[PDB]
Amino acid sequence: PFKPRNYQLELALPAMKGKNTIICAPTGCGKTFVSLLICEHHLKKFPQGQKGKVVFFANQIPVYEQQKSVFSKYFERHGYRVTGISGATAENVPVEQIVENNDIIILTPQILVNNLKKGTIPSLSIFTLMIFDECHNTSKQHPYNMIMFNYLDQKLGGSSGPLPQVIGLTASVGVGDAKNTDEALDYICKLCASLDASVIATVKHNLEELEQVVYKPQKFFRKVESRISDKFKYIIAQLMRDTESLAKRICKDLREFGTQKYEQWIVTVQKACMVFQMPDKDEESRICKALFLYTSHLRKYNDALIISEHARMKDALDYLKDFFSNVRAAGFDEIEQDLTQRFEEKLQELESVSRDPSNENPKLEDLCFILQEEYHLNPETITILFVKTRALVDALKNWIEGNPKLSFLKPGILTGRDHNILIATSVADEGIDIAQCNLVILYEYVGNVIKMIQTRGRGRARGSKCFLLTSNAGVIEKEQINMYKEKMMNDSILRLQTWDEAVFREKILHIQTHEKFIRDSQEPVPDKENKKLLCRKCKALACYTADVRVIEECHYTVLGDAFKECFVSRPHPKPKQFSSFEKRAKIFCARQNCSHDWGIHVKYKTFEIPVIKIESFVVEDIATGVQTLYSKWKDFHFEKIPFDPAE
Amino acid sequence: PFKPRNYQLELALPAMKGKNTIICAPTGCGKTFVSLLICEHHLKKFPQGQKGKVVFFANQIPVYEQQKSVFSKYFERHGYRVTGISGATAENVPVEQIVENNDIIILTPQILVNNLKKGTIPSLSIFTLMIFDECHNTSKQHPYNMIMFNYLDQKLGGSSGPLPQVIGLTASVGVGDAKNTDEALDYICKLCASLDASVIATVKHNLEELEQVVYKPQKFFRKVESRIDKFKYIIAQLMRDTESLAKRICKDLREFGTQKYEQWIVTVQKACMVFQMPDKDEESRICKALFLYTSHLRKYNDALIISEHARMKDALDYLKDFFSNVRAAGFDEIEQDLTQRFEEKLQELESVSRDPSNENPKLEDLCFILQEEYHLNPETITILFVKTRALVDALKNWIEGNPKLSFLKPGILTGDHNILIATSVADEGIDIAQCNLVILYEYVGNVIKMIQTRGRGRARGSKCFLLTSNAGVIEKEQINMYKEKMMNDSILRLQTWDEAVFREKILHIQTHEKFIRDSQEKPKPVPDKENKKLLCRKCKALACYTADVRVIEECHYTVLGDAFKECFVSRPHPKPKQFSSFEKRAKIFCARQNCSHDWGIHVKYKTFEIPVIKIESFVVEDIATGVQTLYSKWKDFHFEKIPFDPAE
Amino acid sequence: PFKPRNYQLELALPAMKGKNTIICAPTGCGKTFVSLLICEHHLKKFPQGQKGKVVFFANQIPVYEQQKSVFSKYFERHGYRVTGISGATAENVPVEQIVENNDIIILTPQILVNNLKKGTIPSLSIFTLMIFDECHNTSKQHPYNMIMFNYLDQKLGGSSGPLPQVIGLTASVGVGDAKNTDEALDYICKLCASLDASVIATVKHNLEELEQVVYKPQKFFRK
Amino acid sequence: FKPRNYQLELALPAMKGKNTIICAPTGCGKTFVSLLICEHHLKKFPQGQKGKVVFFANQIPVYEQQKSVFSKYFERHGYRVTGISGATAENVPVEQIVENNDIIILTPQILVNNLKKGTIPSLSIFTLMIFDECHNTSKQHPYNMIMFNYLDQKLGGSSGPLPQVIGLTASVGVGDAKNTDEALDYICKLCASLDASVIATVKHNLEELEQVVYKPQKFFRK
RNA sequence: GAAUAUAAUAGUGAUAUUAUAUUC
RNA sequence: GAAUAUAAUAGUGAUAUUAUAUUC
RNA sequence: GAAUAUAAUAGUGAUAUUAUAUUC
RNA sequence: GAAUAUAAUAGUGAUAUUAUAUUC
Ligand SMILES: *O=P([O])([O])OP([O])(=O)O[C][C]1O[C](N2[C]=[N+]([C])C3=C2N=C([N])[N]C3=O)[C]([O])[C]1[O]
Ligand SMILES: *OP(=O)(O)OP(=O)(O)OC[C@H]1O[C@@H](n2c[n+](C)c3c(=O)[nH]c(N)nc32)[C@H](O)[C@@H]1O
Ligand SMILES: *OP(=O)(O)OP(=O)(O)OC[C@H]1O[C@@H](n2c[n+](C)c3c(=O)[nH]c(N)nc32)[C@H](O)[C@@H]1O
Ligand SMILES: [Mg+2]
Ligand SMILES: [Mg+2]
Ligand SMILES: [Mg+2]
Ligand SMILES: [Mg+2]
Ligand SMILES: [Zn+2]
Ligand SMILES: [Zn+2]
């Protein structure tokens, strides 16, 4: 083995005495070793005639694989059978038998949730020690919090069995919407109540050792103003008012370009447009479809304005060109040809402006400055760059590759499902420990306190730096308050460590009883009338609510050979074997040049069936006639006829 | 059991004597009982230490089912096991054990062919009796003759195995293209050679009994005058420039409204797809335009023909349906242009389809006939035969679209009711309702079909009208009526021969044909290892490469790689069949814009879900030279054919 | 192919859930189509890597031939090999081979009894569904009861072989020498135990449909 | 991962279902051959059936290595990979661990003991067996014992569905043979020991194999 | 030839007799 | 999807086109 | 396909829209 | 502790001794 650091022993200590401990320590100080310590001690604690059963909850699959590997190779030599159950290997298997025949089990929490609800696992008394990776997640309706709901429901009751010790691991417990230390302490106590925790473990005695292991990178604030003059926006504005005029040639207008309020307004406008009714129901299709294409088009224009605001004009122009070309590759329409022909008119001027040197972004200029300087002082620099969207990932990557100034940069991509600089959208929690970046750069990217603290893990080496480039003061302040909330966090934790076990446990039990009472006191009318499901783009008859069958009380399919004529299929670009289903292809509308995303086509059990989403269908009651729109399927209450194999 | 006819015993007598014989009896005199009698005698002739094994050959599934049920219901009581194997129940089952563990096996011939070729069934020595239903099909490359090729190849060889007795069943052996009796004689001898028959059994000493059961319907010939042009001087110019705006693109070196015009448009269309162009981008535009133009032209031709044979209203509704489907398959500038030109002149029409002034005299003659025959007998059951499947519901809508024929209840028979409209039934087939009236609307086939059609009305008083506006049809029927005489006379002449002499003439012909077939084998392909690019035929978009194409069971062709998966779209198959070890899951079309040209189908082969394509939907470009060649069949396209391997 | 009565679906419902079921319905309601539905659904329920094997038990030869005919005509199209073995075609034939190589097998019960006793058929595990026509004969030592004796003797013993679902078809289970209610009930329970049944399917919801298809004839007594 | 060609050439006979003795120089990469064979074998069964692979390693380091690889590789595709060694074998239900998993890595002595104890009915529960260092399959070695069970069930009256056998080695040996024919018969005896019908060797991709694994020059000092 | 079931008739019954039907 | 047959048409023919039907 | 979380924006908020990420 | 393999040395060999290594 290897000699463990003293602060790791210090963090493991509260948990090794058998207390439900939330361990809060810096990202990358070696929490895995602590986990192995606590687990080893826990399993060694039991006498003859009984062997403990530990379970480790990991949120993401990489963490699942990592921890499963480490735990296996570490503990198998000591005679402890280690297993793991992920989403893939959790179907058609006796999960109960797998749990009982193993000492250590690495799980994703959704599995245990579904197993508890299904009843395959009776209670959590089977376990002796539950560990929560990224514990702080155990709030709201997170799977962690569901497991803990079962735990507390079993605890808070006369019929109580032997419950397992609950250990939590995190780098930040968070403080929520707190503005002062008291509210923060309240939030932290609520979290400890969520985990039935009585002790918060932080490094106190061996602080300096930890300060020589993990380092806090110096953070810098880069406030640059917007682009001075935008000819691009001056063109796209006019195009969008021409599109707005094309759309206003039909209906009433009941806002600023390049804004988010506009992006919401166009959504509500489109949603309101696909409700429009006509006795013809033929020209209605043309009007609604046009009022879909217009909306979507000027929406793409808005997106292009945002991209233009956060990157090169060439990036936005390439976004528009990409969009219109993908529209051109997928059939054609009179409206589509119209708008396109309108766009290519302004295209030449647009690239006359885009290929102009004076039309450069200062926000990218300062980034180029920081990159040039930091790579000049140290040409062995490993950079990471966080941005909001994927469009900005591609744009910044092409900007890096297409810049004489930055010919020393070999960019890489880290987008949700070697090099010098990685370009990523966001990473949930800490995740699998990646290569060390001595330069973190936040490009219009600011999250909460927990994410801020976790981000320090990227550069836990001495001399690491973290810049924050923005053209919005609200961003700067939003990052400023996070540090104050971290202060409030550590101070609240430090005051909470002064309390004695009795008082804290009493408070915890009190709170637990409180939201248990909230949950229990919390806990419908299906109109069996038939309704036509129409295409949200064509207003054409897709199906009927009677033909719709519901699988697993979550998924929805259509019955009859009548529906098979209404859609078309294209082999799924990203197939997946989720639950008891297997994605085979995507399903779109079939009426003329439409092809609107209706749903997918999957293999389920012994049937090849089409599954739809109500987010792309209009519900029309035949009697009343009025049309309505629904997002979640659960909002659409009706006679949900269950699925039967005899049809 | 049931008391049989005497002519049945007479027909079954040469077969029961153990001689390979062809039975020629009028349609519907009960050949089933003959089969049952022959089988019963053949099975119960054997001793105790030996057992017989009979195999029956039905060409189609209805006959398969019927014969299987009858044989099983009749022979089980006698202690014989009867089974059947068709294409549906042929997969994943040991057919040799099914054959061995049974006494009577009803088969579709393709099953036995495939099993013999594969090797699951060693030889035909297993059977002691083979019976061919509609044995007139024993010729050319038909599965029957494919079986008899095996039979003879074993017979005409040093390898000697106990070969089964061969019985044939038909109402006509045919005469081929014989101009005289001595040629028809040679044809019949050739057929008997193909079936290794030494006897031709017909009714003779009991004809007086037979002719009181099967009555020959009287055959009236109705020659009518043609239409005299409310739909001719309208679509004429339409065709004229719909050809010439295709000529606007390029010059291309023949009366309109005919079949020759169809062939012309077809070959032209198959000559436009190979227009190599350096621009490539607008090559797609040109080809996708010309394809649409020709596709409109030929269906215009179809409308013209339909008008020439039926109502003009249906000739309109045809085009209306066509443009409806075109508008439903996505709107194109060219398509909406031709559609605009069509609907511009559509106002002139429809009104023309609404005048009684221009009504097809053929349909009026048909109305006259039907009204007459249903006046004389209201309980008349009429069956009608048309050339194409287009004229079926055309004549149907003509019937109910007429108050004069309000006493008619049309029925359909293609792929309760007074009249049944149909295309063309293969052979005798499963027996349907007995008809008192048979009408042939421009429908004349071979002599065998003529003789077999008499089975539709084998009762007394049955009639058959041949309604046509062409003399060639009439003469084509008369030559058949002469061919029947030639056949019967040749048969009666052969029945005077000595059995031995006939046997050696048969043997002679057999050896001749065997030598021919043996020497017919040839060095056919030198596989081109050069990688060829397969493009679409309509929009000329790149479909795939020859390196990606795999061949399955030396017949079908799939595409590997994830590259091709982004080249096509799919919609659930209209008629989901199940052929071989496959299963039609859906259809497969192009993806380049709304081209939507049919490429093939998407099937479920074992544990794979794969695309299967037909070469007649693609253009074979050469990646090296650029010579765009076309192939109508996969076997005509010789290239480096790599057998499908699950390893991939 | 078409228009099944709703009471037929109601009767086939418990058997389409794998439950061993005795079906009790008036004579002439159409038990054949019920058998066809149950059997069909039983066949289409198996995945690709697995297959089913249904066996029908007819007590008489005419019923045998009729059922074999119907099942053959109906399931040939779908791709199921249907065969039959009676006393006339039972000698000098490989019953193991005939049973395996077919998906649906129609038998007279004495055949199965004899071939089980001989050892030619090892166990009933080869079957996935057994249907009994006139299942009220499952008593004393009628061939049905012997077959079920083998079934039970494999069930209750140490043998853990996968036993097939059991369906019975009758218009009257009988009461025997019962003189009151809970005697008749005990008799019926004894019969259900003889057939390993746990569900007795009868018409309850679609009575109004059935009573318009099958009429009870008025009875008279002339002394 | 970017595979080599000779690996595919070595795996191909095994993927066709034939029992195969793969003989290739040490260091060529038999691991990816194992992974490929296992992947193709498991992802070939229909829905109504499932595959069960068993991997035999004679040493604990090789055992934990292979277990690590197979677990980190087949978890994604949806196959439960587990391992049994001398440490964990005691006081555990073996047949349950075997049936509840798709890929089972173990030392041969384990399976021998559980076959002798009768806790496992037969090898029919497996569909693919893979002997690492299959040259050990001789004499009283555990490999040859397992194969003795296999052959006893094979040549016996019983007709249970037997798993296909893949062996992995760099040498098969020739024993105390003097000429090529005795060596041939000994090799045939080894093939009979593993019920193999094909000996996989690199042929059409030697130019690459030599580019990968080189042969060291030898010197003799007397 | 044998087996099986239903019914009537005597015995408390094991059953026996006859009738009827089915099966191998 | 593939194979086979029949009919018409172009052709000296091997063939080709279309129509129709069947089978695997 | 569905569920969960984070952030921005509208709203008093329960919520809603968008973006992002994850899970089954 | 037990089982197993490789090598050398004895011997006709089954085997034996020893060395080395592995596994349970
Ligand atoms: O088309 P398949 O490959 O699935 O095979 P099949 O049996 O239908 O062959 C029939 C031929 O006719 C054409 N076809 C097929 N479908 C489904 C249609 C058509 N033609 C029209 N006008 N409408 C159809 O729906 C094919 O070319 C095929 O070769
Ligand atoms: O599309 P599915 O119904 O199979 O579900 P999903 O898990 O794959 O989620 C995709 C959903 O997000 C939207 N979406 C964005 N982008 C860029 C894509 C894409 O490239 N391909 C697909 N199929 N969907 C995309 C969709 O709205 C979808 O619902
Ligand atoms: O016993 P068998 O070998 O004779 O065969 P079987 O089953 O057909 O006969 C059964 C018994 O019935 C008797 N029996 C024959 N006949 C013609 C009659 C009859 O007409 N009426 C009665 N009441 N019995 C008959 C046979 O003698 C045989 O014992
Ligand atoms: Mg085929
Ligand atoms: Mg006997
Ligand atoms: Mg789900
Ligand atoms: Mg021991
Ligand atoms: Zn639509
Ligand atoms: Zn195309």
PDB file of N, CA, C and O in Angstrom, chain A residues 33-48:
ATOM      1  N   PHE A  33      -8.844   7.674  -1.223  1.00  0.00           N
ATOM      2  CA  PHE A  33      -8.073   7.001  -0.185  1.00  0.00           C
ATOM      3  C   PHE A  33      -8.830   7.012   1.137  1.00  0.00           C
ATOM      4  O   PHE A  33      -8.816   6.032   1.884  1.00  0.00           O
ATOM      5  N   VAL A  34      -9.493   8.130   1.416  1.00  0.00           N
ATOM      6  CA  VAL A  34     -10.317   8.256   2.611  1.00  0.00           C
ATOM      7  C   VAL A  34     -11.467   7.255   2.567  1.00  0.00           C
ATOM      8  O   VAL A  34     -11.758   6.586   3.560  1.00  0.00           O
ATOM      9  N   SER A  35     -12.107   7.153   1.406  1.00  0.00           N
ATOM     10  CA  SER A  35     -13.186   6.191   1.197  1.00  0.00           C
ATOM     11  C   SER A  35     -12.710   4.769   1.465  1.00  0.00           C
ATOM     12  O   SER A  35     -13.383   3.998   2.153  1.00  0.00           O
ATOM     13  N   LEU A  36     -11.545   4.432   0.918  1.00  0.00           N
ATOM     14  CA  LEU A  36     -10.961   3.110   1.109  1.00  0.00           C
ATOM     15  C   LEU A  36     -10.647   2.848   2.578  1.00  0.00           C
ATOM     16  O   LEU A  36     -10.817   1.733   3.065  1.00  0.00           O
ATOM     17  N   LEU A  37     -10.189   3.883   3.277  1.00  0.00           N
ATOM     18  CA  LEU A  37      -9.884   3.774   4.699  1.00  0.00           C
ATOM     19  C   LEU A  37     -11.138   3.484   5.518  1.00  0.00           C
ATOM     20  O   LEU A  37     -11.188   2.512   6.277  1.00  0.00           O
ATOM     21  N   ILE A  38     -12.145   4.338   5.353  1.00  0.00           N
ATOM     22  CA  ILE A  38     -13.414   4.196   6.060  1.00  0.00           C
ATOM     23  C   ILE A  38     -14.053   2.841   5.779  1.00  0.00           C
ATOM     24  O   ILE A  38     -14.541   2.173   6.691  1.00  0.00           O
ATOM     25  N   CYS A  39     -14.037   2.436   4.513  1.00  0.00           N
ATOM     26  CA  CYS A  39     -14.624   1.163   4.111  1.00  0.00           C
ATOM     27  C   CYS A  39     -13.874  -0.020   4.719  1.00  0.00           C
ATOM     28  O   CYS A  39     -14.489  -0.947   5.248  1.00  0.00           O
ATOM     29  N   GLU A  40     -12.546   0.020   4.640  1.00  0.00           N
ATOM     30  CA  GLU A  40     -11.710  -1.048   5.182  1.00  0.00           C
ATOM     31  C   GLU A  40     -11.928  -1.205   6.681  1.00  0.00           C
ATOM     32  O   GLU A  40     -12.135  -2.317   7.176  1.00  0.00           O
ATOM     33  N   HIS A  41     -11.884  -0.085   7.397  1.00  0.00           N
ATOM     34  CA  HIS A  41     -12.116  -0.093   8.836  1.00  0.00           C
ATOM     35  C   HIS A  41     -13.510  -0.624   9.159  1.00  0.00           C
ATOM     36  O   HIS A  41     -13.684  -1.418  10.086  1.00  0.00           O
ATOM     37  N   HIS A  42     -14.495  -0.187   8.380  1.00  0.00           N
ATOM     38  CA  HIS A  42     -15.882  -0.596   8.579  1.00  0.00           C
ATOM     39  C   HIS A  42     -16.057  -2.102   8.429  1.00  0.00           C
ATOM     40  O   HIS A  42     -16.714  -2.743   9.247  1.00  0.00           O
ATOM     41  N   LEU A  43     -15.464  -2.663   7.380  1.00  0.00           N
ATOM     42  CA  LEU A  43     -15.572  -4.094   7.122  1.00  0.00           C
ATOM     43  C   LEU A  43     -14.752  -4.909   8.117  1.00  0.00           C
ATOM     44  O   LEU A  43     -15.095  -6.050   8.423  1.00  0.00           O
ATOM     45  N   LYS A  44     -13.671  -4.322   8.622  1.00  0.00           N
ATOM     46  CA  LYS A  44     -12.828  -5.008   9.595  1.00  0.00           C
ATOM     47  C   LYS A  44     -13.432  -4.951  10.996  1.00  0.00           C
ATOM     48  O   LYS A  44     -13.070  -5.739  11.869  1.00  0.00           O
ATOM     49  N   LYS A  45     -14.357  -4.017  11.199  1.00  0.00           N
ATOM     50  CA  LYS A  45     -14.967  -3.803  12.511  1.00  0.00           C
ATOM     51  C   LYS A  45     -15.803  -4.991  12.983  1.00  0.00           C
ATOM     52  O   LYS A  45     -15.815  -5.316  14.170  1.00  0.00           O
ATOM     53  N   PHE A  46     -16.499  -5.634  12.050  1.00  0.00           N
ATOM     54  CA  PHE A  46     -17.401  -6.734  12.381  1.00  0.00           C
ATOM     55  C   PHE A  46     -16.666  -7.942  12.958  1.00  0.00           C
ATOM     56  O   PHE A  46     -15.560  -8.267  12.524  1.00  0.00           O
ATOM     57  N   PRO A  47     -17.282  -8.606  13.948  1.00  0.00           N
ATOM     58  CA  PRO A  47     -16.743  -9.830  14.551  1.00  0.00           C
ATOM     59  C   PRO A  47     -17.109 -11.074  13.748  1.00  0.00           C
ATOM     60  O   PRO A  47     -17.576 -10.959  12.614  1.00  0.00           O
ATOM     61  N   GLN A  48     -16.903 -12.248  14.336  1.00  0.00           N
ATOM     62  CA  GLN A  48     -17.247 -13.501  13.675  1.00  0.00           C
ATOM     63  C   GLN A  48     -18.754 -13.732  13.702  1.00  0.00           C
ATOM     64  O   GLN A  48     -19.431 -13.363  14.662  1.00  0.00           O
TER      65      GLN A  48
END
